[PDB]
Amino acid sequence: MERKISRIHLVSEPSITHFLQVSWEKTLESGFVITLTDGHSAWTGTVSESEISQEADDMAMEKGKYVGELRKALLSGAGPADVYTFNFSKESCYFFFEKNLKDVSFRLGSFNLEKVENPAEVIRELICYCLDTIAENQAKNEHLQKENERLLRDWNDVQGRFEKCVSAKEALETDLYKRFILVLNEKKTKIRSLHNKLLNA
Amino acid sequence: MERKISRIHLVSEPSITHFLQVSWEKTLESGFVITLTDGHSAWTGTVSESEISQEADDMAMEKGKYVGELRKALLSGAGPADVYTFNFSKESCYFFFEKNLKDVSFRLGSFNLEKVENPAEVIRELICYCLDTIAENQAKNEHLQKENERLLRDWNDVQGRFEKCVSAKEALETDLYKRFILVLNEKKTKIRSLHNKLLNA
Amino acid sequence: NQLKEVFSGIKNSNEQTPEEMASLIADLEYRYSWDCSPLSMFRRHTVYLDSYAVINDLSTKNEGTRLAIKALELRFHGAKVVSCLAEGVSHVIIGEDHSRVADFKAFRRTFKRKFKILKESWVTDSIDKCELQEENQYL
Numbered sequence: 455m456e457r458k459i460s461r462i463h464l465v466s467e468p469s470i471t472h473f474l475q476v477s478w479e480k481t482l483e484s485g486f487v488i489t490l491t492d493g494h495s496a497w498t499g500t501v502s503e504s505e506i507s508q509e510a511d512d513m514a515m516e517k518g519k520y521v522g523e524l525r526k527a528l529l530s531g532a533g534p535a536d537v538y539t540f541n542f543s544k545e546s547c548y549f550f551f552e553k554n555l556k557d558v559s560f561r562l563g564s565f566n567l568e569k570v571e572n573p574a575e576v577i578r579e580l581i582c583y584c585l586d587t588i589a590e591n592q593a594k595n596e597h598l599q600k601e602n603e604r605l606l607r608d609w610n611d612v613q614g615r616f617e618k619c620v621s622a623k624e625a626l627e628t629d630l631y632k633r634f635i636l637v638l639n640e641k642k643t644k645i646r647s648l649h650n651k652l653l654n655a
Numbered sequence: 656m657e658r659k660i661s662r663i664h665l666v667s668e669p670s671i672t673h674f675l676q677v678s679w680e681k682t683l684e685s686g687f688v689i690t691l692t693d694g695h696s697a698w699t700g701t702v703s704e705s706e707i708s709q710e711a712d713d714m715a716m717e718k719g720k721y722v723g724e725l726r727k728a729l730l731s732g733a734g735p736a737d738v739y740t741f742n743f744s745k746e747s748c749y750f751f752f753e754k755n756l757k758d759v760s761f762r763l764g765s766f767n768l769e770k771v772e773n774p775a776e777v778i779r780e781l782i783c784y785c786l787d788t789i790a791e792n793q794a795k796n797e798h799l800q801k802e803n804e805r806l807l808r809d810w811n812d813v814q815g816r817f818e819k820c821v822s823a824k825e826a827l828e829t830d831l832y833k834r835f836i837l838v839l840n841e842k843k844t845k846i847r848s849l850h851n852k853l854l855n856a
Numbered sequence: 857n858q859l860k861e862v863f864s865g866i867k868n869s870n871e872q873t874p875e876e877m878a879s880l881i882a883d884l885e886y887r888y889s890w891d892c893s894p895l896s897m898f899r900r901h902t903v904y905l906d907s908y909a910v911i912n913d914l915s916t917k918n919e920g921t922r923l924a925i926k927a928l929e930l931r932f933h934g935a936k937v938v939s940c941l942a943e944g945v946s947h948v949i950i951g952e953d954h955s956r957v958a959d960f961k962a963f964r965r966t967f968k969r970k971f972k973i974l975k976e977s978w979v980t981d982s983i984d985k986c987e988l989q990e991e992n993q994y995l
Binding site: 459461470471473492493494573574575576577578580581582584585587588591592594595598599601602605606608609612613615616619620623626627630631634637638641644645648649651652655 | 660662671672674693694695774775776778779781782783785786788789792793795796799800802803806807809810813814816817820821824827828831835838839842845846849850852853856
């Protein structure tokens with residue numbers, strides 16, 4: 455069970471903004487439930503799998519593209535170049551959404567909703583869910599920050615250890631090579647002395 | 656500007672949850688605004704620095720301690736060993752909260768809230784603020800998770816690099832020692848040849 | 857065992873300087889053709905990193921990235937990591953940030969001796985091979 459909340463500004467009433475929550479079990483292919491609210495009244499509707507199939511058949515549109523467009527519009531997936539317009543009529547209890555492109559609008563979907571007996575329950579549930587999600591996000595942020603701090607400390611420890619290793623390697627190399635060059639210089643001096651003695655005799 | 660929402664259960668109606676939001680400019684000491692809503696109607700009130708100071712003086716406690724207790728109560732900061740009772744008389748439009756403690760009720764605060772004629776606007780504003788907060792938290796969490804993944808990858812890379820470096824360090828000494836022994840043996844052969852030539856001469 | 861005992865006999869020797877020690881090491885490698893060893897093959901080449909937000913400044917270190925560990929690995933293998941962009945620099949490594957490639961090219965043109973532009977992935981790939989891969993594929 456997953457629910458997503460979005461804000462829509464109806465062209466009929468641009469000043470006011472409505473909140474629509476869509477709840478689905480696993481995917482929208484099997485339908486879902488949409489609840490629209492304005493702060494004073496609420497409407498509810500169901501788009502169960504049968505309704506989605508009927509709409510797709512009526513529109514003669516591919517199911518994959520249908521679900522993709524639903525993801526883009528209902529879940530607020532619209533891109534920068536994609537604009538969708540929603541219009542809800544309470545007198546007819548209808549709610550239809552379309553896409554505007556190249557100054558021409560293509561109908562995308564239309565549903566029917568029934569006014570709930572009382573909106574207070576819907577408002578309270580929405581606010582409770584929002585607060586719970588905020589608390590969960592706060593907890594996740596704290597945990598991620600602690601993990602990031604631990605990881606940064608570990609990286610600093612690694613850097614220090616590698617610095618120590620490279621310094622030790624360099625020191626060992628220079629010391630051993632200095633000893634070797636000293637020994638070789640002594641050997642070369644002896645070689646030169648022996649060569650001079652051989653030349654003498 | 657800071658705001659904090661919380662859920663409470665009024666003793667008058669222990670069946671629904673009322674959402675109260677406390678908004679303060681910079682700190683709770685300077686004052687705050689309390690807005691309580693049950694999802695249908697909203698009551699707004701304000702408390703200033705003078706009122707808080709008078710309340711602290713009346714109850715004979717330090718201003719800091721009283722402010723801390725007020726934050727613990729209203730802002731949902733209650734710990735494990737504490738409980739508070741909030742009651743709002745709608746007929747008198749009088750809200751007040753007390754600290755229940757082992758069959759002893761202590762009045763903690765009391766305000767007079769005036770019902771607002773447009774609860775829809777405040778409900779929509781609260782919902783919009785919650786949506787913005789959750790969106791910002793989700794974006795921050797995603798960014799932090801990406802940073803953590805990057806740091807983990809870097810840590811694995813550097814750890815493997817250190818493993819290889821330390822593995823090669825031990826063989827470094829053996830290799831240079833073998834090279835030194837080889838060159839010294841060559842010098843040994845040269846000096847032996849020179850000595851043999853000198854003896855022959 | 858004899859060589860170890862002889863080396864242990866010497867007490868200490870700290871009379872030379874890093875430049876003199878590097879020159880002596882390079883001379884020994886050239887004389888005895890010891891350049892085929894897996895390490896110390898970067899000794900003849902000086903290496904620079906783009907770890908500073910502003911070129912030739914010692915107060916803007918960008919520590920906290922993969923560049924530092926890359927430089928440390930290069931130095932361990934034998935590369936001479938130099939902190940001042942002298943005219944004698946021969947190898948320069950630039951990471952994912954290519955903003956200052958033009959400045960590096962201009963500096964290379966100005967300098968009498970040109971240093972080939974190199975990337976961080978080249979050394980990362982070359983460590984496993986322990987050989988100097990052609991820079992034409994990583995310019």
